[PDB]
Amino acid sequence: MSKGEELFTGVVPILVELDGDVNGHKFSVSGEGEGDATYGKLTLKFICTTGKLPVPWPTLVTTLVQCFSRYPDHMKRHDFFKSAMPEGYVQERTIFFKDDGNYKTRAEVKFEGDTLVNRIELKGIDFKEDGNILGHKLEYNYISHNVYITADKQKNGIKANFKIRHNIEDGSVQLADHYQQNTPIGDGPVLLPDNHYLSTQSALSKDPNEKRDHMVLLEFVTAAGI
């Protein structure tokens, strides 16, 4: 029942802005949608504003607002994400694509009025030109669900590590090992959680009337483990 949680009682507009550079291939993505945390529900549409996306859309899903997770009543004292609002939190990750490159991301998630904003900088290096990522060999779907969270008292925040498996067009899988750290932007108290996890269901689709490179995403996220 943090003060921040009060800001998520209804439907909240979401805005996402990302600037990326993977092996020198620069691009930007903008996203808009709404989140209804009471139901852990998110609906968003992302657009590559610079032209064609140089990496597969599925590889950007985790990067492109865990504050919309549905935390059960008995676990609300463990919701760090909403507790950091409205000032927000910094979310950083290193994503290692097995036998390929890695992404390093830094984002600031905070409210700008009624809108929950996620601003991100993504840097990818060491990718293979004809690999599954730069070669666009990943299927347009998603199969991974869990995020394991632990408290990071020393930083007044949290950390998380989890695996994302991306189906490759040949039936194989491209592993993306995620390492995450979140820290509050404000100086007020936040909720440091006991170990638990977030279970997310992500469905990717296309807007039939959209000609720009884009991704429509419907997600449901629920906290559990306690």
Asked if residue 47 lies in contact with residue 147, where contact means CB atoms within 8 angstroms, the answer is no
- Placement of tokens 């989140």 in the chain: 35
Give, in degrees to the nearest 5, the angle at Cα 78 between 75 and 80.
140
Asked if residue 67 lies in contact with residue 118, where contact means CB atoms within 8 angstroms, the answer is no
- Three-state DSSP class for residue 39: helix
- Residue 75 Cα distances to 31, 145, 193, angstroms: 30, 19, 9
- Three-state DSSP class for residue 114: coil
Q: Which two tokens stand for residue 75?
A: 């676990």
Identity of the residue numbered 16: V
Which residue numbers in the chain precede an interruption (C–N > 2.5 Å)? 64
Residue 96 CA neighbour count, 13 Å, CB half:
7
Output b/e per residue, 133-147; b: 16+ Cβ within 10 A. bbeebbbeebebeeb
Which residue ranges form the domains of the chain, and what is each CATH number?
1-226 (2.40.155.10)
Query: Phi and psi for 134 in degrees, rounded to 5?
Result: -65, -20
**Burial label, 9 (beta-carbon count in 10 A; 0-12, 13-18, 19+):** exposed
Q: Which two tokens stand for residue 155?
A: 């930083």
Residue 43, C-beta contacts closer than 8 angstroms, at least 6 positions apart: 33, 34, 35, 217, 218, 219
Q: Which two tokens stand for residue 157?
A: 């925040």
Distance CA 94, CA 103 (A): 6
Name the resolution in angstroms. 1.1
**Own/partner long-range contacts of 160-166 (Cβ < 8 Å, ≥24 apart):** 164/62, 164/95, 166/56, 166/58, 166/59, 166/132, 166/138, 166/139, 166/142
Asked if residue 138 lies in contact with residue 127, where contact means CB atoms within 8 angstroms, the answer is no
